[PDB]
Design a protein around this motif. Structure first.
Motif, PDB file in Angstrom:
ATOM      1  N   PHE A 211      25.304  82.601  -5.298  1.00 19.36           N
ATOM      2  CA  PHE A 211      24.763  83.268  -4.128  1.00 19.36           C
ATOM      3  C   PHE A 211      23.339  82.724  -3.874  1.00 19.36           C
ATOM      4  CE2 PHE A 211      27.448  86.857  -5.945  1.00 19.36           C
ATOM      5  CZ  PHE A 211      28.331  87.020  -4.888  1.00 19.36           C
ATOM      6  N   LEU A 212      22.996  82.722  -2.544  1.00 15.76           N
ATOM      7  CA  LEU A 212      21.628  82.262  -2.129  1.00 15.76           C
ATOM      8  C   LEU A 212      21.002  83.475  -1.463  1.00 15.76           C
ATOM      9  CD1 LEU A 212      23.196  79.481  -2.373  1.00 15.76           C
ATOM     10  CD2 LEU A 212      21.702  78.636  -0.592  1.00 15.76           C
ATOM     11  N   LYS A 213      19.763  83.781  -1.877  1.00 15.24           N
ATOM     12  CA  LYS A 213      18.974  84.817  -1.187  1.00 15.24           C
ATOM     13  C   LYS A 213      17.715  84.117  -0.621  1.00 15.24           C
ATOM     14  CE  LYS A 213      16.062  87.017  -4.680  1.00 15.24           C
ATOM     15  NZ  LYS A 213      15.510  88.440  -4.862  1.00 15.24           N
ATOM     16  N   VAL A 214      17.227  84.660   0.419  1.00 14.14           N
ATOM     17  CA  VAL A 214      16.013  84.120   1.113  1.00 14.14           C
ATOM     18  C   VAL A 214      14.763  84.599   0.397  1.00 14.14           C
ATOM     19  CG1 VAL A 214      14.794  84.029   3.361  1.00 14.14           C
ATOM     20  CG2 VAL A 214      17.301  83.772   3.242  1.00 14.14           C
ATOM     21  N   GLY A 215      13.983  83.703  -0.135  1.00 19.31           N
ATOM     22  CA  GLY A 215      12.706  83.939  -0.810  1.00 19.31           C
ATOM     23  C   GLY A 215      11.947  82.591  -0.886  1.00 19.31           C
ATOM     24  N   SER A 216      11.676  82.288  -2.189  1.00 18.36           N
ATOM     25  CA  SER A 216      10.943  81.045  -2.500  1.00 18.36           C
ATOM     26  C   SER A 216      11.918  79.846  -2.204  1.00 18.36           C
ATOM     27  CB  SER A 216      10.418  80.923  -3.882  1.00 18.36           C
ATOM     28  OG  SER A 216       9.865  82.174  -4.308  1.00 18.36           O
ATOM     29  N   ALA A 217      11.289  78.716  -2.008  1.00 17.02           N
ATOM     30  CA  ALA A 217      12.012  77.463  -1.720  1.00 17.02           C
ATOM     31  C   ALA A 217      12.634  76.951  -3.012  1.00 17.02           C
ATOM     32  CB  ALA A 217      11.068  76.416  -1.121  1.00 17.02           C
ATOM     33  N   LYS A 218      13.753  76.316  -2.882  1.00 14.77           N
ATOM     34  CA  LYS A 218      14.521  75.730  -4.029  1.00 14.77           C
ATOM     35  C   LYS A 218      14.277  74.214  -3.935  1.00 14.77           C
ATOM     36  CE  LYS A 218      17.273  76.264  -7.653  1.00 14.77           C
ATOM     37  NZ  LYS A 218      17.184  77.241  -8.763  1.00 14.77           N
ATOM     38  N   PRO A 219      13.458  73.718  -4.871  1.00 13.19           N
ATOM     39  CA  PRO A 219      13.060  72.351  -4.958  1.00 13.19           C
ATOM     40  C   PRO A 219      14.207  71.384  -4.870  1.00 13.19           C
ATOM     41  CG  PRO A 219      11.705  73.626  -6.513  1.00 13.19           C
ATOM     42  CD  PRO A 219      12.774  74.508  -5.908  1.00 13.19           C
ATOM     43  N   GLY A 220      15.175  71.655  -5.730  1.00 11.67           N
ATOM     44  CA  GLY A 220      16.382  70.927  -5.931  1.00 11.67           C
ATOM     45  C   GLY A 220      17.320  70.869  -4.738  1.00 11.67           C
ATOM     46  N   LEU A 221      17.067  71.654  -3.711  1.00 10.95           N
ATOM     47  CA  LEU A 221      17.941  71.693  -2.568  1.00 10.95           C
ATOM     48  C   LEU A 221      17.381  70.820  -1.425  1.00 10.95           C
ATOM     49  CD1 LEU A 221      20.415  72.827  -1.038  1.00 10.95           C
ATOM     50  CD2 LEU A 221      19.040  74.848  -0.502  1.00 10.95           C
ATOM     51  N   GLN A 222      16.126  70.474  -1.428  1.00 14.99           N
ATOM     52  CA  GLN A 222      15.439  69.758  -0.433  1.00 14.99           C
ATOM     53  C   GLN A 222      16.028  68.370  -0.039  1.00 14.99           C
ATOM     54  OE1 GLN A 222      13.305  71.443   1.305  1.00 14.99           O
ATOM     55  NE2 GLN A 222      13.171  69.817   2.800  1.00 14.99           N
ATOM     56  N   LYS A 223      16.561  67.647  -1.026  1.00 15.92           N
ATOM     57  CA  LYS A 223      17.204  66.372  -0.833  1.00 15.92           C
ATOM     58  C   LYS A 223      18.366  66.527   0.167  1.00 15.92           C
ATOM     59  CE  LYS A 223      18.665  63.375  -3.195  1.00 15.92           C
ATOM     60  NZ  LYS A 223      18.967  62.044  -3.881  1.00 15.92           N
ATOM     61  N   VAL A 224      19.077  67.646   0.019  1.00 18.20           N
ATOM     62  CA  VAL A 224      20.221  67.919   0.900  1.00 18.20           C
ATOM     63  C   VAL A 224      19.744  68.324   2.290  1.00 18.20           C
ATOM     64  CG1 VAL A 224      22.190  69.425   1.216  1.00 18.20           C
ATOM     65  CG2 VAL A 224      21.822  68.316  -1.021  1.00 18.20           C
ATOM     66  N   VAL A 225      18.771  69.190   2.332  1.00 14.99           N
ATOM     67  CA  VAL A 225      18.202  69.683   3.639  1.00 14.99           C
ATOM     68  C   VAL A 225      17.749  68.563   4.521  1.00 14.99           C
ATOM     69  CG1 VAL A 225      16.160  71.018   4.427  1.00 14.99           C
ATOM     70  CG2 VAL A 225      17.947  72.125   3.109  1.00 14.99           C
ATOM     71  N   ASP A 226      17.022  67.612   3.956  1.00 13.48           N
ATOM     72  CA  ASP A 226      16.450  66.503   4.627  1.00 13.48           C
ATOM     73  C   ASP A 226      17.483  65.527   5.279  1.00 13.48           C
ATOM     74  OD1 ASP A 226      13.695  67.331   4.146  1.00 13.48           O
ATOM     75  OD2 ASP A 226      13.528  65.866   2.506  1.00 13.48           O
ATOM     76  N   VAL A 227      18.660  65.394   4.685  1.00 15.32           N
ATOM     77  CA  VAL A 227      19.702  64.508   5.203  1.00 15.32           C
ATOM     78  C   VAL A 227      20.577  65.088   6.299  1.00 15.32           C
ATOM     79  CG1 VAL A 227      21.511  64.971   3.406  1.00 15.32           C
ATOM     80  CG2 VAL A 227      21.273  62.657   4.392  1.00 15.32           C
TER      81      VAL A 227
ATOM     82  N   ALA B  11      27.064  60.217   5.413  1.00 15.45           N
ATOM     83  CA  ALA B  11      25.888  59.478   4.922  1.00 15.45           C
ATOM     84  C   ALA B  11      25.958  59.237   3.443  1.00 15.45           C
ATOM     85  CB  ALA B  11      24.591  60.198   5.307  1.00 15.45           C
ATOM     86  N   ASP B  12      25.494  58.064   3.040  1.00 13.26           N
ATOM     87  CA  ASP B  12      25.474  57.710   1.598  1.00 13.26           C
ATOM     88  C   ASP B  12      24.613  58.787   0.955  1.00 13.26           C
ATOM     89  OD1 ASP B  12      27.154  55.508   1.848  1.00 13.26           O
ATOM     90  OD2 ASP B  12      25.478  54.132   2.213  1.00 13.26           O
ATOM     91  N   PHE B  13      25.002  59.255  -0.222  1.00 16.68           N
ATOM     92  CA  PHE B  13      24.221  60.319  -0.818  1.00 16.68           C
ATOM     93  C   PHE B  13      24.355  60.220  -2.319  1.00 16.68           C
ATOM     94  CE2 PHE B  13      23.144  64.928  -1.506  1.00 16.68           C
ATOM     95  CZ  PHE B  13      21.831  64.857  -0.904  1.00 16.68           C
ATOM     96  N   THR B  14      23.709  59.221  -2.885  1.00 14.75           N
ATOM     97  CA  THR B  14      23.735  58.924  -4.346  1.00 14.75           C
ATOM     98  C   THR B  14      22.548  59.544  -5.083  1.00 14.75           C
ATOM     99  OG1 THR B  14      22.538  56.944  -3.783  1.00 14.75           O
ATOM    100  CG2 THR B  14      24.920  56.746  -3.785  1.00 14.75           C
ATOM    101  N   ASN B  15      22.728  59.674  -6.361  1.00 20.22           N
ATOM    102  CA  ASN B  15      21.719  60.145  -7.298  1.00 20.22           C
ATOM    103  C   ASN B  15      21.226  61.555  -7.054  1.00 20.22           C
ATOM    104  OD1 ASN B  15      21.226  56.855  -6.808  1.00 20.22           O
ATOM    105  ND2 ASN B  15      21.129  57.374  -8.961  1.00 20.22           N
TER     106      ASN B  15
END
Ligand SMILES: [Hg+2]
Ligand SMILES: [Hg+2]
Ligand SMILES: [Zn+2]
Length: 255
Positions: A142-158, A169-173
């Motif tokens: 589950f995801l709740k709205v609060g602090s930002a999740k560092p590890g999710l940013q790579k996905v958000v940006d693409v 889109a290529d999405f390696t590493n």
């Protein structure tokens, strides 16, 4: 099939009669009726050697695909028997912060729900796994709205790159370990896929502890299109199925 008034969950039965089957998913998790089972082994998540390949908009969500030709990223233990391989992950989200998840806890709805899909290796390929009552294993967070999740940013940006249906889109590493809560305590029950063909092949593993994401991160999800490029714009939001009857099944807790 989609999530609109004319093609929504309420219509799916016409095309997939299994929709009103015996072990449909998602369901409400009643924390007081769930059975503590002491015979449940701790989950074993081995994603250190994961290989991400690409991300794509399939018109109902965005999938992050992994190389499942070897035991690179596996789930074992808990209520499972054998090794299950990671094939993809995706999310379900709402139009507002107060709705989005598929599963509910004591009727509580979360902003979104992450699904990590795995198939049972004794079956050789995903396609054959979905022909078995124990073919899949889905880890639900589950995801709740609060602090930002560092590890999710790579996905958000693409996401900007796969805005409409059919784009990839290529999405390696990409390291999926960045999306897991601190605690691995969970509830488990037998169910189904939550999207067509809604096949009853899944052992559900829902983690008790939510991860928090920021408002801005979830906002980006909401900017995706259901539609194909050059078509009328329909924002990809509320791509979730409402809870289904438990129908006798018993939900077990590892805690
Ligand atoms: Hg399935
Ligand atoms: Hg099945
Ligand atoms: Zn899902």
């Amino acid at each position: 099939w989609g999530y609109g008034k004319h093609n929504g969950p309420e219509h799916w039965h016409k095309d997939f009669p299994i929709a009103k089957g015996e072990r449909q998913s998602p369901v409400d998790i009643d924390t007081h009726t769930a059975k503590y089972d002491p015979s449940l082994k701790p989950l074993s998540v081995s994603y250190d050697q994961a290989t991400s390949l690409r991300i794509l908009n399939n018109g109902h969500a965005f999938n992050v695909e992994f190389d499942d030709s070897q035991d690179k990223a596996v789930l074992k233990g808990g209520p499972l028997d054998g090794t299950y391989r990671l094939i993809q992950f995706h999310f379900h989200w709402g139009s507002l912060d107060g709705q989005g998840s598929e599963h509910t806890v004591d009727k509580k709805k979360y902003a979104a729900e992450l699904h990590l899909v795995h198939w049972n290796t004794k079956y050789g390929d995903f396609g054959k796994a979905v022909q078995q009552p124990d073919g899949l294993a889905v880890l639900g967070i589950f995801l709740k709205v609060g602090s930002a999740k560092p590890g999710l940013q790579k996905v958000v940006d693409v996401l900007d790159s796969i805005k409409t249906k059919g784009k990839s889109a290529d999405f390696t590493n990409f390291d999926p370990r960045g999306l897991l809560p601190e605690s691995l305590d969970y509830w488990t029950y037998p169910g189904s896929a939550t999207t067509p063909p809604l096949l009853e092949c899944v052992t559900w593993i829902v983690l008790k502890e939510p991860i928090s994401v920021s408002s801005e991160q979830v906002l980006k999800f909401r900017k995706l299109n259901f539609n194909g490029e050059g078509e009328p714009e329909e924002l990809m939001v509320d791509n979730w199925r409402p809870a289904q009857p438990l129908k006798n099944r018993q939900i077990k807790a590892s805690f």
